[PDB]
Design a protein around this nucleic acid. Structure first.
Ligand SMILES: [Mg+2]
Ligand SMILES: [Mg+2]
Ligand SMILES: [Mg+2]
Ligand SMILES: [Mg+2]
Ligand SMILES: [Mg+2]
Ligand SMILES: [Mg+2]
Ligand SMILES: [Mg+2]
Ligand SMILES: [Mg+2]
Ligand SMILES: [Mg+2]
Ligand SMILES: [Mg+2]
Ligand SMILES: [Mg+2]
Ligand SMILES: [Mg+2]
Ligand SMILES: [Mg+2]
Ligand SMILES: [Mg+2]
Ligand SMILES: [Mg+2]
Ligand SMILES: [Mg+2]
Ligand SMILES: [Mg+2]
Ligand SMILES: [Mg+2]
Ligand SMILES: [Mg+2]
Ligand SMILES: [Mg+2]
Ligand SMILES: [Mg+2]
Ligand SMILES: [Mg+2]
Lengths: 50, 138, 199, 190, 176
RNA sequence: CCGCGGCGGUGCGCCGCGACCGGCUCCGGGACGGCUGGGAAGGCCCCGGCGGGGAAGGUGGCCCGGGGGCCCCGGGUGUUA
RNA sequence: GGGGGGCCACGCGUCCCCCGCGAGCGCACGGGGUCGGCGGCGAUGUCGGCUACCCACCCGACCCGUCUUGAAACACGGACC
RNA sequence: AAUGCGAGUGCCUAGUGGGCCACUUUUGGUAAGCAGAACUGGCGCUGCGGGAUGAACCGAACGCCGGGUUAAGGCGCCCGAUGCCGACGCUCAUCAGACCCCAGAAAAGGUGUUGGUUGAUAUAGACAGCAGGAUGGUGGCCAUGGAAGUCGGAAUCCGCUAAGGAGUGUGUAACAACUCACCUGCCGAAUCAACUAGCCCUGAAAAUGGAUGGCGCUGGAGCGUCGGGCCCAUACCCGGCCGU
RNA sequence: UGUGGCGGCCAAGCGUUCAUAGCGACGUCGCUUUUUGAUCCUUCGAUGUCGGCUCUUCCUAUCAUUGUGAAGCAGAAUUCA
RNA sequence: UAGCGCCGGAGCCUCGGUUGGCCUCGGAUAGCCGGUCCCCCGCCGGGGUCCGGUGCGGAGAGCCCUUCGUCCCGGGAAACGGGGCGGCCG
């Protein structure tokens, strides 16, 4: 794993495979999810999903 | 030499798929291996269907190649397909395979006893016809 | 308790792969008429394919090398063995349950021979594709007993024809007797009709 | 692409009686009987028409290679009709420069001996196909005539006797010697 | 794009960001063929970034709907205009298909290009799909089904279900 | 000491079975509702009714051809019979 | 705001703007399993013993030490105690 | 500003200081499993599932176990899993093809077959296929020993015309000799040319016998585009136990 | 695989005429490891280092012989495949 | 072929696997199957016609056998039937 991507995956608290977290969205968050884009699968959760 | 063809108005029996065991009437031919088909009186919606999953019967009803479900129903009811199909020997042996599957354990014992007695009665007559044919010749 | 599989009209690899699993499942299989097995592809191509097998021998001592068996039964046996773990003792025990033959041997002449539709030519090949008979292929690479097997098969066919006529005679006799005793089997026959046995 | 239907048609004359056993065509008439088997083509043959005046060949769902075989059958059946009604005659000359090609006929036309071809001492004995009769004809100097009902057997025997007299390790453009097919036709005219 | 399953046929409307220069941008509608709306929006941004000078960050998706087949119970001739990449060169085509739905015809077109020219779905670029009258068709594979009294048999019925009677006694029949 | 006594704990010589409860899973069968182009199509009401069109993968007819006992087949004209 | 079904709403006595303890009794999707449920066999041929003796089968499995970027190496050392 | 995390600081200190490989960038060299750099990740130091085999490739990193589910890969038989009535096409090889690294091919071709692009002419009757006619100027002028519609090169115009051009073939010292184009004859529905793209074939020759892993496979068990279902790693979830 | 060896594609020309019977410039695409290089991966606690003799097997890029196609093949002789 | 062979009650060790049987046409697949012989040839066989089936029912999606036992009295079915000693074909 690339070091810049490791740092963002640790700041998102995704240190293990199949870990999930809730992230609020703004420009500073989209520009980090773009960096960790090939290593994650993110989306917009339902109320029943929460 | 072929006798059953795919034309407009050919009754086909669907052998597998979701609409299995049902009669349909071929309305139009979409491609090499697909027909737009519709069974009005056999609870089949008008839909596409591959030729691999239909077994075509010897029933021909006349309607145009683009007429809708109302006219295919009117052609089905005048030709009276649902009783002639049940009168044919194909649906009789379909019904026989359904009865033999529906057959229970008590029905198995009764069929066992009756088949044993009927087989013994047939074999005695078979032996008598053998010795009669042998006594006529030799 | 034993499968007897007729080899005529079957494709060699598909039949061998189907036999190889069933014989590993602890079942005795006897594959009969291996000269009637046929291979997809044209005959000269298949003959060249076997000639390339003939050319592969141990250079320093060919008596230790690959044993190129010329009988069709042993060719089919060699194909089945390549589909088996034959260097282990379950593979050798599987190979012990296979019994391949040319023609119909007189244990299996008065026995009924099963057909595998997943290996037949008419099912698994297009009609406009050429095929090669294993009997002629083996005869042209050095099988010596095509002529003896042909006459011994024909002498069996004319013998089994007489059995077929005598069986059809009994079939006409039983269908006549069924009409003759129809008055007294009437209560036993509708009960077979209402459960689908005789409709 | 696969064409849905391809059909062609042979018009059979009233002198000919034709019958079929699946894809095995039997043709009977004034000169004899010819049988040809067509189980390698995989088509549908139909003897429609009352008194059987017309024969129809069908290919259903065939590609370009499979559609070429229809008029092949329609030509073969026409060849059998022509060979049972009128027959087949292969008139063929023998061309030589110095040595006359000595041709003699044995066993009622089933074997032909060739002597003195290019001055050779070897005798070329040509077996003929069963059903073909060969004879030395008249009114012409050096000409043989082959007779039969089957165009296949007659022309294959003509090819055998033509390839029997071939020139080895010479310029064949200069040594124009042999027995060559001159005319292909029928026994009686139409 | 990966042509997964059958395609659905989407109407996608988008526009640019309203700026002090352009206070209201023109709305742009496109006819996208995609397995889902997530792929459809991405293909919309690909096509519109190729045609206009507008990007995903500089614009927005105003509408993205699946627009259905107006008549999926009649058979129709569909003419499809292609733009694909080969191994050496890129080419345009016009192809014809017979189908009940437009998206089904385009789905058939993707398999047709993959089958005949080994063209993957990312190189295939659909540019116009049109319902074509039967007198305006050109391909003989499609024009041969324009017959009112169409008739053919099923000549060589190969036996499927080869493993439920797997060891059987009677040999199979192909004539029906 | 006796009882095959009651409650409380600990357990069976060995081989086993069943019951219910709880945790984690993989499946199955029903039933209820929201949204869309407030689904698209489709069914029934004489073709839902009336009026006006269009043309073919052309139904009746009519004509031309070829095998029949009026019924089939092929082509042509054409707008609904 | 004016004139049939669910509500974690059920005090009395005023001022006033808007017009601090009721007892009992049981049931349980409730802070990790129990039965207040049973059946067979057992003294010269049988019960239990996973490990340890031998053998059989399936899957896996190249001989260690060392130097080395890299050793099973056709790289060196090594019969055994 | 967002997100996340307890930080700061001082002593003593072993081993190492031969490296190598990969995406991308890149130097020398024809090139190299060659030599030399940058970045990041690996191997070395590391097992496991897959790539048949295997330092580095894909997935995933490891306490001892039970249940479930996956990744990368696969599911004819070896060999767990498609024994789905899987979908649509393409392809016949007398050298078929078959999965990153990766373990073998190019230019040029094919009237094999399939799909396209473009341009013609076709009921004022076309492509085939079976005849006449190709000459008058002219044996053009040109350059030659001479080239006469034909061995070179500037030129390239008329008549009669249904047609007929200083002209595509075979030949002589110049002759002689001979035919496509163009026009009618018969016939009655589509036909012709130039490109381009897939699969297959030619190009395609090495030494022990031989390797899609093998058997084998052609209504694929081959190639392309794609559905469900299924298999299992030490990986993920739940639970037990040990240790930190 | 530079070099050596072998084979192609195009065709200006040679061949009395005539590109392609047989050749083939200017260009260009490949194959092989029977030439020499380039490299340094294995071997320096040693793999006996040139020839010749002897003996066996394999390859085809075929000199002759078997079967054939093409010539600027009349025969004979000789070339190409 | 020497203490060994062939035929007609008891038990003791050891090796194990299994838990009804199918006693048969040839084969075709753009085609089959069975009858019928009123036809025509033969060594009952061969061809044609005609009549029936053909998602195979004269069907392996199949067929046969089916076991709790004994007793009394009936009614169906058998009487040519069930089982027990010497010969002939193949
Ligand atoms: Mg010579
Ligand atoms: Mg192993
Ligand atoms: Mg060392
Ligand atoms: Mg080293
Ligand atoms: Mg080290
Ligand atoms: Mg070591
Ligand atoms: Mg080594
Ligand atoms: Mg050392
Ligand atoms: Mg030593
Ligand atoms: Mg380096
Ligand atoms: Mg490390
Ligand atoms: Mg690792
Ligand atoms: Mg590999
Ligand atoms: Mg596990
Ligand atoms: Mg595998
Ligand atoms: Mg846990
Ligand atoms: Mg060179
Ligand atoms: Mg010249
Ligand atoms: Mg180095
Ligand atoms: Mg050494
Ligand atoms: Mg040595
Ligand atoms: Mg050679």
């Amino acid at each position: 794993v690339s070091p810049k991507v490791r740092k963002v995956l640790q700041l998102l608290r995704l240190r293990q495979i199949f870990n999930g977290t809730f992230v609020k969205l703004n420009k500073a968050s989209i520009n980090m999810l773009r960096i960790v884009e090939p290593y994650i699968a993110w989306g917009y959760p339902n109320l029943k999903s929460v | 030499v072929f006798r059953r063809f795919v034309e407009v108005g050919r009754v086909a029996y669907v052998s597998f798929g979701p609409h299995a065991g049902k009669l349909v009437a071929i309305v139009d031919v979409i491609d090499q291996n697909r027909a737009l088909v519709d069974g009005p009186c056999t609870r089949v919606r008008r839909q596409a269907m591959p030729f691999k999953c239909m077994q075509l019967t010897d029933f021909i009803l006349k309607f145009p190649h683009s007429a809708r479900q109302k006219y295919v129903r009117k052609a089905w009811e005048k030709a009276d397909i649902n009783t002639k199909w049940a009168a044919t020997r194909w649906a009789k042996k379909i019904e026989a395979r359904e009865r033999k599957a529906k057959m229970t354990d008590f029905d198995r014992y009764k069929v066992m006893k009756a088949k044993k007695m009927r087989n013994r009665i047939i074999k005695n007559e078979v032996k008598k016809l053998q010795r009669a044919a042998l006594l006529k010749a030799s | 308790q034993v499968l007897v599989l007729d080899g005529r009209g079957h494709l060699l690899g598909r039949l061998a792969a189907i036999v190889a699993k069933q014989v590993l499942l602890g079942r005795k299989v006897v594959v009969v008429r291996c000269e009637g097995i046929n291979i997809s592809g044209n005959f000269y191509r298949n003959k060249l394919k076997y000639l390339a097998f003939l050319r592969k021998r141990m250079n320093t001592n060919p008596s230790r090398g690959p044993y190129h068996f010329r009988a069709p039964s042993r060719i089919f046996w060699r194909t089945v063995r390549g589909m088996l773990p034959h260097k282990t003792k379950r593979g050798q025990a599987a190979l012990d349950r296979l019994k391949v033959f040319d023609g119909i041997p007189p244990p299996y002449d008065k026995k009924k021979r099963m057909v595998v539709p997943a290996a037949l030519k008419v099912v698994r090949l297009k009609p406009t594709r050429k095929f090669a008979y294993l009997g002629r292929l083996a005869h042209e690479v050095g099988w010596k007993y095509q002529a003896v097997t042909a006459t011994l098969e024909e002498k069996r066919k004319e013998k089994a024809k007489i059995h077929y006529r005598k069986k059809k005679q009994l079939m006409r006799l039983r269908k006549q007797a069924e009409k003759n005793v129809e008055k007294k089997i009437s209560k036993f026959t509708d009960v077979l009709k209402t459960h689908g046995l005789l409709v | 692409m696969k064409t849905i239907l391809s059909n062609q048609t042979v018009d059979i004359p009233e002198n000919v009686d034709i019958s079929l056993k699946g894809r095995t065509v039997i043709v009977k008439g004034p000169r004899g009987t010819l049988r040809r088997d067509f189980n390698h083509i995989n088509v549908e043959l139909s003897l429609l028409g009352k008194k059987k005046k017309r024969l129809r060949v069908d290919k259903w769902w065939g590609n370009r290679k499979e559609l070429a075989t229809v008029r092949t059958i329609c030509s073969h059946v026409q060849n059998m009709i022509k060979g049972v009604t009128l027959g087949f005659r292969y008139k063929m000359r023998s061309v030589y420069a110095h040595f006359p090609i000595n041709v003699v006929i044995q066993e009622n036309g089933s074997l032909v001996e060739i002597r003195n071809f290019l001055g050779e001492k070897y005798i070329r004995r040509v077996r003929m196909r069963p059903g073909v009769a060969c004879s030395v004809s008249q009114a012409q100097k050096d000409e043989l005539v082959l007779e039969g009902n089957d165009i296949e057997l007659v022309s294959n025997s003509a090819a055998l006797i033509q390839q029997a007299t071939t020139v080895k390790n010479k310029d064949i453009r200069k040594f124009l010697d042999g027995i060559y097919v001159s005319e292909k036709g029928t026994v009686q005219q139409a | 794009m990966k042509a997964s399953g059958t395609l659905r046929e989407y109407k996608v409307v988008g526009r640019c960001l309203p700026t002090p220069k352009c206070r209201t941008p023109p709305l742009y509608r496109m006819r996208i063929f995609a397995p889902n709306h997530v792929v459809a929006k991405s293909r919309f941004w690909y096509f519109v970034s190729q045609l206009k000078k507008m990007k995903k960050s500089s614009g927005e998706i105003v509408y993205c709907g699946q627009v259905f087949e107006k008549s999926p119970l009649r058979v129709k001739n569909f003419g499809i205009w292609l733009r694909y990449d080969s191994r050496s060169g890129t080419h345009n085509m016009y192809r014809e298909y017979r189908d009940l739905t437009t998206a089904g015809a385009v789905t058939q077109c993707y398999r047709d290009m993959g089958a005949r020219h080994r063209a993957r779905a990312h190189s295939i670029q659909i540019m116009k799909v049109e319902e074509i009258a039967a007198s305006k068709c050109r391909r003989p594979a499609v024009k041969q089904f324009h017959d009112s009294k169409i008739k053919f048999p099923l000549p060589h019925r190969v036996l499927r279900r080869q493993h439920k009677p797997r060891f059987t006694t009677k040999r199979p029949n192909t004539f029906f």
